[PDB]
Amino acid sequence: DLASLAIYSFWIFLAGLIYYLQTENMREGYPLENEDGTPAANQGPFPLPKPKTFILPHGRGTLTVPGPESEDRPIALARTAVSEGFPHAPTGDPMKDGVGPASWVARRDLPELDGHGHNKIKPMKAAAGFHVSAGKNPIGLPVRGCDLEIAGKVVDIWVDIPEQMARFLEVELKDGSTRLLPMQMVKVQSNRVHVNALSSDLFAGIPTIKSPTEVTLLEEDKICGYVAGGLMYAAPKRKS
């Protein structure tokens, strides 16, 4: 009957749909590889989808996926076993090298632009008409690392103009240079800003930005990467 028809029909629809859904999520990081980077033998039942090309605003070109994949940065890792499936140990300083939970991707070295073609993110000093409207203004508060030692002082807030949001705290270190600190990895308190991931001694290692009034996708990744990695690698310095 009709009902039987409809339901049998639907289970068929649903199956080609999953198939679709699945092949679309195969647009990045495919095809699969062996730990040595050579193409892996068994890529699953699903074919790579036919490529699609994105037209990036503000004449920043196009992006076609799937496409040629490459890390475009050295990886300082060495195998710890003779068969597949085991960890790869950092061969240096994982933090300094950017592997592990400290990994960063070679994103473009251009900043994210808003709808108008202006830098999406800005130090608040250069963002005409922005102010802390609620909560504790961090600016001026010392910054404490997981080792409970003071590392610097907030000397500005880098805001996201189109979404009117605090993205990073800029921090002034003992030598007078500054670093960005992701907003998402610090606790703003009444008399201090506490950073659990990094011990005071690692703040200097936080990668620097080439221009003082801009951050690029590459530098966001290298920074967030680094600060995140502290959680696992600063661990010996963290007390509480």
């Binding site: 859904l21 990081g29 409207s133 949001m165 993205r167 998402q184 990467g225 600060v227």
Partner: protein, 302 residues
């Protein structure tokens, strides 16, 4: 403890954002509204502006007419007494015409006519608002996802109070406007058709509902888990994969064996939610038009 990013710990404000302009008739957009610092702790603090336009007004006017046409009926039931009105608010009900009138538009007002008026108002209200979702997107050069997604919802509503009443031969088969009354109608609709738990569309529909919660839980917690690498900035991540997208995909690959991309995850999304009322609509449509009792149907498959 570590910061979780469920609530902002510092609010920043700037000049009211009047938004992108593209092909939008700026003459129709309103003025910026105030800013809720309340809202500001969760998401955006800025209210407005909003785009009015012809369809917005028609929609918005029919919308109120519907609501009011029901409202006066409730008052008439309450003996115009504000006390009764409050006491009995969920008990009042605007019911469709008796099965006697069939698909007739001639039912007396106290006997079903008022229900038709209200519905007519809702019909126009809803469709105009649909056209509104479409146009608003066109005027910014955007995909029409939202209008099509919306259409799914519309499907189930179309079926409940219009398509099924018409295929059954009478408006009396439609849903009454009322809080407790539309609950009862639902409960009763299952009893009559032999328990909707045997309607395999119903069962499918529940799977996608349950799933929507499962997924929006998964997606939300993930993006928050990697917002420490600017995860929420999904458009740029699509355009240039960040570590965020990577850690996201990998956490899931390592847990359950496969994974999404940042554009990908959102296709899972729109389809999981859209299938709820899509399947739903179908389950109800066959109910009583082709299948009288899902248990009996369940025994044979035919």
């Amino acid at each position: 403890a570590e910061y979780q990013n469920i609530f902002s710990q510092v609010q920043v404000r700037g000049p009211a954002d009047l938004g992108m302009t593209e092909d939008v008739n700026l003459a129709n957009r309103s003025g910026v509204g105030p800013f809720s610092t309340l809202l500001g702790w969760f998401g955006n603090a800025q209210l407005g502006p909003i785009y009015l336009g012809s369809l917005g007004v028609l929609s918005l006017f029919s919308g109120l007419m519907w609501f009011f046409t029901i409202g006066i009926w409730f008052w008439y039931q309450a003996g115009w007494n504000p006390a009764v009105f409050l006491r009995d608010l969920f008990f009042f009900s605007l019911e469709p015409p008796a099965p006697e009138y069939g698909l007739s538009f001639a039912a007396p007002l106290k006997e079903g006519g008022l229900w038709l008026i209200a519905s007519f108002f809702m019909f126009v209200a809803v469709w105009s608002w649909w056209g509104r979702t479409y146009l608003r997107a066109q005027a910014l050069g955007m995909g029409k996802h939202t209008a099509w997604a919306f259409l799914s919802a519309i499907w189930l509503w179309m079926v409940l109070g219009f398509i099924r009443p018409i295929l059954m031969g009478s408006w009396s088969e439609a849903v009454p406007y009322g809080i407790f009354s539309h609950l009862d109608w639902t409960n009763n609709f299952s009893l009559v058709h032999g328990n909707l738990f045997y309607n395999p569309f119903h069962g499918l529909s529940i799977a996608f509902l349950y799933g929507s919660a499962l997924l929006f839980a998964m997606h939300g917690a993930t993006i928050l888990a990697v917002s420490r690498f600017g995860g929420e900035r999904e458009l740029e991540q699509i355009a240039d994969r960040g570590t965020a997208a990577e850690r996201a995909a990998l956490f899931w690959r390592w847990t359950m064996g496969f994974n999404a991309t940042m554009e990908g995850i959102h296709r899972w999304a729109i389809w999981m939610a859209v299938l709820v009322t899509l399947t739903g609509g179908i389950g109800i449509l066959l109910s009583g038009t082709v299948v009288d009792n899902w248990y009996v149907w369940g025994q044979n498959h035919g």
